Structure 1
Amino acid sequence: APDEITTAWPVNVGPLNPHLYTPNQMFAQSMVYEPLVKYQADGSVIPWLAKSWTHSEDGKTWTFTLRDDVKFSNGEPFDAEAAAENFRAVLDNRQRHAWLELANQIVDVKALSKTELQITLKSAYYPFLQELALPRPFRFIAPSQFKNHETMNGIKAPIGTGPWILQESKLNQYDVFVRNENYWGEKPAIKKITFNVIPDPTTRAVAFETGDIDLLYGNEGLLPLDTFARFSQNPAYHTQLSQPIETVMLALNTAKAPTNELAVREALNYAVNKKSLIDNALYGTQQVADTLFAPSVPYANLGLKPSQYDPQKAKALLEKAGWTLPAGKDIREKNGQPLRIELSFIGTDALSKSMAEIIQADMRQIGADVSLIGEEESSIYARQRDGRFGMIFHRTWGAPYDPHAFLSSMRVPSHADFQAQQGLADKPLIDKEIGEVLATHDETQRQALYRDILTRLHDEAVYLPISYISMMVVSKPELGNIPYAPIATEIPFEQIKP
């Protein structure tokens, strides 16, 4: 079956509610559901379900002219009415979308005709179009599949307009998609895609080696990285490594001793040998990160000063702040209190554990005692939400989220970044400026605001950037070159052409 492929994912795709989150998987929501406008690698959007649009002079009122030839996979029409009902369904659950500022900005959505859709905003919101382009929540399910005229309490069949249709799903076993033969756009070359549920990275590698699957596609956690390197030399296989898509880092709790001290956070940022970490734990497959956002990220080329690995500097900073070594001890003390920091991570994640152990070792070398707290996923996310951590592994979100959406979410208290930043004297100013940068259209001011926000976060040593990570691919050669999608969390299956 040349036009059928089998791949893997750590979990099922979920029920494919276009408007909800976990356990829904974003790449799968994007396979079935489509946006008004589609995100492009150059940062722009192109017409998609909307073929054109205009906006008022004040930038608060937008009118979209929709395609008139689009049907949902069940034959029902896509029109402005269906689109408007979707926006209502999403914003009826507005509290759940607080992280996404567009969901707080939309004041009204109404269908003016079958082809005219009008959206009104609280303010001129500059990332409007890019947030419409996201995998979720502003994509469109057939309104017939609402449950009692809503989606927040569940849907019936996951009926979208997209190039893929969910055929069937088996909890903890597999998901099967097929090509939408009545798609309004270009027909995918692939006719059927099977996702085998395989939570363990080694088991995924083994599944490929045995031929049980044709394709592996994911971030640095896709498979063991030593194994990936071996595969990249195996002439029976094909492998790919993308240019970096996002940052992996530690978040340091500015509201909790001892990471509440700037001098301590600064020292920690000099203590880790990132190159060695990446060569030791990531098998040399990723890039060193010096800043929250790579210099290639929009608005983030700011000439921020890296803190290079320098244990001598780290020690000096701690000594100057009164953190000194007692006789016959390797761990520093101040006011009799030991320099002890808890590093929280998902205990079953081998890669995270490996990095955590390297970080612990590096920090012990400069007199800081890091305790490793490996816990189940739910417990770690709970800690993130309420700030019950000293240090935690964290990551940015990739295009088109970085930086505007990641920054926007820093304002949401139930979220790791707010919690990490909560102890900063300048946190209210930062949150004020984040609000301002999203709504200004003085472009000069926009750049200045981004500079100030990112520079304060950098100078305050809120994060310990570790790596800019890449997408990775392992595939049967017969599938050919595997494309990457403009949106980092999407998988462009319809672009695969064996």
Structure 2
Amino acid sequence: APDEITTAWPVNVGPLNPHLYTPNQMFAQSMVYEPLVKYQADGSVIPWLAKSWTHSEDGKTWTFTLRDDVKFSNGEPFDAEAAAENFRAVLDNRQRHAWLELANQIVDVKALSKTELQITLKSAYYPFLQELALPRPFRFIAPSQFKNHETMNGIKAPIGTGPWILQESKLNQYDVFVRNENYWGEKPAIKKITFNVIPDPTTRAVAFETGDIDLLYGNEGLLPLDTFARFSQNPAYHTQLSQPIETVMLALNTAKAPTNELAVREALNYAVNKKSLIDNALYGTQQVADTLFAPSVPYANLGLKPSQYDPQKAKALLEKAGWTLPAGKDIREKNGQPLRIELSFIGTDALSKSMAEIIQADMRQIGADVSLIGEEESSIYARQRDGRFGMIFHRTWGAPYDPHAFLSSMRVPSHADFQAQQGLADKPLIDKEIGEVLATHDETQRQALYRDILTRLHDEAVYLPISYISMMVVSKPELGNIPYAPIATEIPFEQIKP
């Protein structure tokens, strides 16, 4: 069947509530649900469910003109009432969306007619349109499928306007999607997509080698990277590696001994041989990261000075800070206290473990004792939210989140970044400036504020950037060239064209 494919995902796609997070998978929410405006790789948006829009001079009131020809997959019309009901349903759960500042800025949403939708904002929020473009939460389910006139407590059928329809889901086995034959836009070439639930990366590679699946698409965790490199040379297969999409880093706890000392954080940022780490654990497949955001990220080409691998310098910094080696020991001490740092990661994630072992080795060579704390996912996320870590693996979010949304979220205390930053004298100023940068319409001031925030974060050595990672593809050749989505968390199945 040349227009049916089988792929894999580590978990089910979830219930496909458009307005909720885990266990809903973003790429799948994006398959069914659509936005008012669609994000493009150049950073702009184009008309989508909204054909056009205007705003007020003060930038607080926006009026969208909607398409008039869009139906939900169940035949019900998409109109301004439906869109307004969705916004209400999202904002009824406002607390859950704190990380996204548009959810705090929207003050009112109302359908002025079937085709006119008015959105009012607290302030002149510059990332407005890009945040409407996101996979979640501002996309649209048929209001008939609300439960008790809400979505925050669940939905009935996951009815969107999008090019794919969920056919069926079987927990821990598979999810099947079919093409929407009444889609308002271009019809996908592919008719059916089956997602086999395959949690282990090795098991995913095996499934591809046996012919059980036709396509694997995902980030650096998709399959073992040595196997990837092998497949890349195998003439029976097709593989791809995108340009980098986001940063993988450690976050260092500025509020916990001994990472509360700037000098210790500086030393750590000279201690890791990142090129080696990438060649060893990532099989040469990713790029070295010197800064939180790659220089290609909007607002982030700042000429920030890299801390290159330099164990001599790391040891000098620590000696100067009073962290010195006792007679016959390899671990430094200050005030009888050992230089001991806990590194938390997801313990069943083989790649993270491999990286953690490398980081531990490199840091031992400069007299820091890194203890590896590998735990289940829920325990790691809990550590991130409450700052119970020394160092922790973390990542940025990709386009169109990076940098404005990721920075916005640094203000939210129940996220790793806030927690890592909590010990900085200038954290309140950073948070103030993050608030300002998002509202400011003076473009000169906006660049200054991004420079200031990112520069403080860099100079304070809050992070240990490791790698700018890429999306990876393995496919049967008959599927052809597999496109990448502008939005880093989306999978553009509708663009596959054998």
TM class by smaller structure: over 0.9
Shift of 1:142: 0.1
Aligned match of 1:269: 269
| Post-superposition CA distance 1:122-169 (Å, at most 9, x none) | 000000000000000000000000000000000000000000000000
Shift of 1:267: 0.1
Distance in structure 2 (CA, Å) of the matches to 1:249 and 1:95: 28
Distance in structure 2 (CA, Å) of the matches to 1:245 and 1:430: 25
Aligned match of 1:246: 246
Distance in structure 1 (CA, Å) of the matches to 2:190 and 2:19: 27
Shift of 1:283: 0.2
Any gaps of 5 or more consecutive residues in structure 1?
none
| Post-superposition CA distance 1:269-323 (Å, at most 9, x none) | 0000000000000000000000000000000000000000000000000000000
Distance in structure 1 (CA, Å) of the matches to 2:136 and 2:311: 44
**1:156 maps onto 2:156 in alignment:** yes
Distance in structure 2 (CA, Å) of the matches to 1:185 and 1:215: 25
Aligned match of 2:71: 71
Shift of 1:242: 0.2
Aligned match of 1:425: 425
Shift of 1:392: 0.2
Shift of 1:350: 0.2
Shift of 1:238: 0.1
| Post-superposition CA distance 1:438-463 (Å, at most 9, x none) | 00010000000000000000000000
Shift of 1:252: 0.0
| Post-superposition CA distance 1:36-83 (Å, at most 9, x none) | 000000000000000000000000000000000000000000000000
Shift of 1:497: 0.2
Shift of 1:427: 0.1
Distance in structure 2 (CA, Å) of the matches to 1:225 and 1:21: 28
Distance in structure 1 (CA, Å) of the matches to 2:162 and 2:378: 32
Matched residue of 1:178: which SS? strand
Aligned CA-pair RMSD: 0.2
Distance in structure 1 (CA, Å) of the matches to 2:426 and 2:27: 37
Distance in structure 1 (CA, Å) of the matches to 2:241 and 2:35: 28
Paired residues, what number? 498
Aligned match of 2:104: 104
Shift of 1:349: 0.3
Shift of 1:108: 0.1
| Post-superposition CA distance 1:335-374 (Å, at most 9, x none) | 0000000000000000000000000000000000000000
Distance in structure 2 (CA, Å) of the matches to 1:37 and 1:340: 49
Distance in structure 2 (CA, Å) of the matches to 1:416 and 1:213: 36
Shift of 1:428: 0.1
Any gaps of 5 or more consecutive residues in structure 2?
none
Matched residue of 1:144: which SS? helix
Distance in structure 1 (CA, Å) of the matches to 2:496 and 2:188: 8
Matched residue of 1:59: which SS? coil
Distance in structure 1 (CA, Å) of the matches to 2:277 and 2:65: 51
Matched residue of 1:202: which SS? helix
Matched residue of 2:226: which SS? helix
| Post-superposition CA distance 1:180-237 (Å, at most 9, x none) | 0000000000000000000000000000000000000000000000000000000000
Shift of 1:479: 0.1
Shift of 1:178: 0.1
Distance in structure 2 (CA, Å) of the matches to 1:406 and 1:398: 9
Distance in structure 2 (CA, Å) of the matches to 1:65 and 1:279: 51
Matched residue of 1:119: which SS? strand
Matched residue of 1:244: which SS? strand
In the TM superposition, 1:443-454 aligns within 5 A as 443-454=443-454
Distance in structure 2 (CA, Å) of the matches to 1:13 and 1:6: 14
Distance in structure 2 (CA, Å) of the matches to 1:56 and 1:196: 48
Matched residue of 1:411: which SS? coil
Distance in structure 2 (CA, Å) of the matches to 1:366 and 1:148: 60
Aligned match of 1:351: 351
Distance in structure 2 (CA, Å) of the matches to 1:375 and 1:477: 38
Distance in structure 2 (CA, Å) of the matches to 1:443 and 1:281: 41
Matched residue of 1:374: which SS? strand
| Post-superposition CA distance 1:88-143 (Å, at most 9, x none) | 00000000000000000000000000000000000000000000000000000000
Moved over 6 A (4+): none
Distance in structure 1 (CA, Å) of the matches to 2:369 and 2:144: 58
Shift of 1:4: 0.1
In the TM superposition, 1:289-300 aligns within 5 A as 289-300=289-300
Matched residue of 1:352: which SS? helix
Distance in structure 1 (CA, Å) of the matches to 2:141 and 2:308: 49
Matched residue of 1:429: which SS? helix
Aligned match of 2:87: 87
Distance in structure 2 (CA, Å) of the matches to 1:45 and 1:199: 34
Shift of 1:471: 0.2
Distance in structure 2 (CA, Å) of the matches to 1:231 and 1:225: 10
Shift of 1:26: 0.1
Shift of 1:492: 0.2
Distance in structure 2 (CA, Å) of the matches to 1:476 and 1:285: 21
Distance in structure 2 (CA, Å) of the matches to 1:294 and 1:328: 41
Shift of 1:389: 0.1
| Post-superposition CA distance 1:386-442 (Å, at most 9, x none) | 000000000000000000000000000000000000000000000000000000010
Distance in structure 1 (CA, Å) of the matches to 2:148 and 2:322: 63
Distance in structure 2 (CA, Å) of the matches to 1:374 and 1:80: 48
Matched residue of 2:410: which SS? helix
Shift of 1:466: 0.1
Matched residue of 1:152: which SS? strand
In the TM superposition, 1:49-448 aligns within 5 A as 49-448=49-448
In the TM superposition, 1:16-27 aligns within 5 A as 16-27=16-27
TM-score, normalised to structure 1's length? 1.00
Shift of 1:27: 0.1
Distance in structure 2 (CA, Å) of the matches to 1:376 and 1:489: 23
Distance in structure 1 (CA, Å) of the matches to 2:156 and 2:394: 35
Distance in structure 1 (CA, Å) of the matches to 2:317 and 2:439: 39
